[PDB]
Design a protein around this ligand. Structure first.
Ligand SMILES: Nc1ncnc2c1ncn2[C@@H]1O[C@H](COP(=O)(O)OP(=O)(O)OP(=O)(O)O)[C@@H](O)[C@H]1O
Ligand SMILES: Nc1ncnc2c1ncn2[C@@H]1O[C@H](COP(=O)(O)O)[C@@H](O)[C@H]1O
Ligand SMILES: [Ca+2]
Ligand SMILES: [Mg+2]
Ligand SMILES: [Mg+2]
Lengths: 590, 548
């Protein structure tokens, strides 16, 4: 057929990825993402991950499968891109080539989809879901060939994974009765892959019964609209009454007006720090600060002490940190800048020792749940690479928001493995930043900036749910501006949020004059009071952060922060949510 | 004489309004008014909160010298505690009392003559700042409202825009006398029935002749000014006089929603509830004050150093206790004496008079408080038994001129039985009702409602989850001046998942409760760690402050 014509083509597909395994959602779904990157094209958009309920309310397999992967007949191009013309035109939505497969008209499509909806409704009369959408700049020719490959991808992994096609360019397709020859399937597969591997094919004939573009359930299932609203809010297919955002909002409002259900509440947005699910805005996590320079040189010393540094790492884990943020800068520890020690030499030994010391005192199989996520405050591609290659780190914390070296973004993807990234807003360096303070609209300039970085990383296949925002308190902000940023923190209610107020100069600015600091050298009695005040002022920001549902706070003082967060969590922990009005009523009757 | 100066002594119920213009001395003006009322009219058996009021559309050393040279009342003062007042119960019902000696009018005529006063005064105000308001119930020995108005006007002249006292009610009576002309010597004769006359009495009696033109019971504006209804709602919400549509509460509620419906303004916004710690106005729910804990155990000199440290670290109030073998007296009195010496020795800055902390004494011992009060050493009684241990202590909350404030805390048992007395049918409301009952008892005994502070007593006869539950439900006190002490208590540790470690976690858990208290607008918090608490409160205050 025209299906097999070897003239190279660039198509835009939109996929849905589903699983119901809570514990392994991330590994399952990220495995599927990578086989889609490998066997289909380039991932150029992702939604958040979502824990979904229906609208009314086995692992070692994978790790071994990655070695025995059949090669693609197309080479995957890791190169960074700034835009993508085909995607820009898919959104317009401008003139593309005619569909290879036969297209149905709007009316017939709708009727065919409605049939499937009512027929499946009757069957269900005779669960937690984990959902994610993706956009693929695809080299595959047509929706059906893609479905054949999708089916193969599924079978390589096998209800553990369900991959659907939601859109494929601007086409409207309904194909009724699909009889596929095991030899026609092979020719499609061999068109894209360097090919028992026959039982796989035999399973597929039964599987592809029909084909629907857009997918049947596209506007009917909230979870799909929910995902598509992150990626392509303004998009309008010929088959839909309105744009994706407009459809999504109507669903939310109608569910509210007609059934008195808040559909948002049952359908949770997820971010991923490492390998497990985190529910957006459901926990304030403590990130422990380990500054190697401060640990070593601030008392007057001239040598790095990796042991002392690793002692502090364990002290933080015990004090209640979930994440450790480790950083160094290239510094000259003598009077003359004559000899100096590199960032690599500051951070990698400490990371190496921590990893060694972890694998020892872990003697029981049980103490591995207690393993902190590891974040590295670096803008250096080489530092990050050695960390990632020797499995020393989980998260890139990039205070330039990946603008120092955008190639650092390539190191956030391996094959199977994805790493998470913090992007922070700043201007200049520590020497210049205090003067770089003019903003046309402080709150929204920083937000738009961070949003643009996200769009860039998302365009290059960094999964949306792995990107965290940091407003960079104290970095090119006057003290009143750091305060204004906190005042307007709600502006990040849709996003994973990572902040760092700890011990910054704007805290002292909140005090009018009208032991929590462990001393490195002897400061005066008057300076000790000021440090107490600052760490306490910080604990006030922890409280504020707690109530504002900030996802991650970066602190020097873990024990103190944890104490605060434990007490606020307890106060919020209520057994019976209406017992307040029930007890009140009982008193009124008494 | 005419049965107006009838020799028979009766007991009537009067409801008064007390108003002033001056914010700075409001408390003093009004409490001087209060004391003269206790002196000259009968017994105060109820009071409203103090209120800051904006009208419906959109120096003081004289007083201190006045209080020395007051004519004695011919009627007697009785400080014994009462449990009930039948005359007052009769007024509330409203059951049968003696016939009004003053000619009454019917509902129809009263309403006409009121509207008439309204329209004539609406016209002069159309031909043309802040008010401080308080109401009281007096069980009076004065025979009739006109006599009462005569004595009221004497009080007003003694104090002389400064003070304005009105009769809101006087039993069940309805009275509208249109043209009052009173002889100079009839005024003397009324005043002489109630007050042992002979300073400069002849000339003030001249002033009063001009002053009484008419008499309206109920007062013309009773139902027509928000500030009057606001006050009365505190005291007598279920009261229904013959001349009113419904009860005071209903009349209050209907005035509130009417301002919302017809004008889109929350009337509550510019009409603020006040409580008083020492001598100044505090706006309810507008500041979380820090109370520094001074626990005395053994040196006076070191303790007084700790006090000065706390003042500088930002404590508004110091709360001193010895009672948690030298006596409680011997622990706390010398410290408080030394403090007051040391404070007076630094008169090197004459302008620090409002830099002085309010002093609170944690005691249930009458003898200790008696010595504190006699020697002007304290401002506030912090009674952890809510004055149930020795209710005679309530007598010490009034000197002639002066009123003292009081914290009423809830507990059960003593420090050794406490932990076992933990059963409650309805924890949050049991404690609330208990504190309301205690408040009702002091208010009945003439303690200003606005000087009474509530403490849920965290950790006293509460399991840890109960202490938490009390915090979770702190909103229950949104109407009340609230004082809480969580600091270093055992339940803080209950929230968490080498020995200076637990000490740290406790202080920091305390700082979490400081944050919560701030957002829940708790009026006073009792802490060991003043600097730390102040740092939290300053930061949270900055974040809340939007300036343009
Ligand atoms: N129940 C009452 N209490 C006090 N004064 C009254 C009463 N009924 C009538 N009056 C008269 O109202 C007149 C005005 O009194 P004044 O201006 O001193 O205070 P007021 O107007 O009663 O106070 P407010 O402005 O709060 O109503 C006086 O001549 C007084 O005799
Ligand atoms: N756009 C589409 N994407 C994925 N599957 C589809 C689509 N249109 C039709 N199908 C069919 O839907 C059926 C049910 O799929 P599943 O629910 O994954 O078992 C299969 O027979 C698919 O061939
Ligand atoms: Ca009296
Ligand atoms: Mg499917
Ligand atoms: Mg008056």
């Amino acid at each position: 057929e025209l299906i097999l014509s070897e003239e190279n083509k660039t198509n835009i597909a939109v996929l849905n990825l589903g699983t119901n395994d809570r514990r392994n959602a991330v590994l399952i779904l990220e495995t599927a993402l990578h086989l889609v990157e490998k066997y289909l094209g380039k991932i150029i958009n992702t939604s958040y991950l979502y824990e979904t309920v229906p609208e009314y309310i086995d692992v070692n397999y994978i790790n071994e499968l990655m070695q025995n992967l059949e090669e693609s007949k197309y080479e995957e191009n890791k190169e960074l891109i700034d835009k993508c013309e085909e995607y820009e035109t898919f959104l317009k939505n401008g003139k593309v080539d005619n569909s290879i497969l036969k297209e149905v008209n709007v009316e017939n499509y709708l009727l065919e989809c409605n049939n499937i909806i009512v027929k499946n409704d009757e069957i269900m009369k005779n669960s937690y879901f984990y959902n994610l959408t993706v956009v693929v700049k695809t080299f595959v020719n047509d929706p059906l060939s893609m479905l054949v490959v999708i089916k193969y991808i599924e079978e390589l992994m096998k209800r553990i994974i369900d991959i659907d096609i939601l859109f494929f360019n601007d086409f409207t397709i309904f194909m009724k009765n699909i009889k596929l020859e095991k030899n026609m399937i092979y020719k499609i597969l061999s068109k894209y892959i360097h090919l028992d591997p026959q039982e796989i094919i035999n399973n597929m004939v039964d599987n592809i019964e029909f084909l629907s573009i857009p997918h049947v359930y596209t506007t009917h299932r909230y979870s799909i609209l929910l995902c598509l609203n992150d990626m392509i809010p303004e998009y309008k297919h010929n088959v839909l009454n309105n744009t994706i955002r407009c459809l999504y909002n109507k669903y939310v409002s109608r569910m509210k007006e007609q059934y008195n259900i808040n559909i948002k509440e049952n359908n949770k947005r997820i971010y991923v720090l490492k390998d497990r699910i985190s529910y957006l805005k459901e926990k304030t996590n403590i990130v422990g600060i380990l500054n190697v320079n401060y640990d070593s040189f601030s008392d007057g010393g001239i040598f790095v002490e990796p042991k002392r540094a690793v002692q502090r790492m364990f002290e933080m884990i015990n004090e209640g940190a979930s994440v450790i943020d480790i950083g160094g800068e290239s510094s000259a520890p003598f009077v003359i800048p004559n000899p100096k020690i590199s960032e690599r030499d500051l951070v990698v030994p400490v990371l190496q020792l921590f990893q060694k010391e972890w694998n020892d005192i872990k003697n029981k199989i049980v103490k591995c749940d207690a393993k902190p996520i590891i974040s590295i405050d670096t803008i250096n591609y080489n530092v990050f690479k050695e960390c990632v290659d020797n499995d020393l780190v989980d998260i890139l914390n990039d205070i330039s928001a990946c603008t120092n070296n955008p190639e650092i973004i390539k190191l956030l993807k391996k094959k199977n493995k994805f790493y998470s990234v913090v992007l922070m807003h700043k201007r200049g360096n520590p020497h210049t930043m205090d003067k770089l303070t003019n903003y046309d609209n402080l709150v929204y300039d920083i937000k738009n900036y961070l949003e643009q970085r996200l769009n860039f990383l998302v365009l290059n296949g960094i999964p949306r749910y792995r990107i965290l925002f940091d407003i960079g308190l104290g970095f090119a902000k006057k003290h009143d501006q750091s305060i204004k940023l906190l005042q307007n923190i709600h502006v990040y209610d849709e996003y994973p949020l990572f902040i760092g107020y700890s011990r910054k100069r704007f805290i002292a600015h909140c005090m009018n004059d009208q032991w929590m600091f462990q001393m490195n050298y002897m400061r005066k009695d008057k300076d000790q009071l000021l440090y107490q005040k600052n760490i306490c002022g910080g604990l006030a920001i922890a409280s504020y952060s707690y109530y504002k549902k900030v996802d991650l706070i970066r602190v020097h003082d873990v024990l103190e922060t944890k104490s605060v967060l434990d007490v606020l969590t307890k106060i919020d922990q209520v057994k019976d949510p209406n017992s307040s009005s029930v007890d009140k009523l009982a008193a009124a009757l008494e």
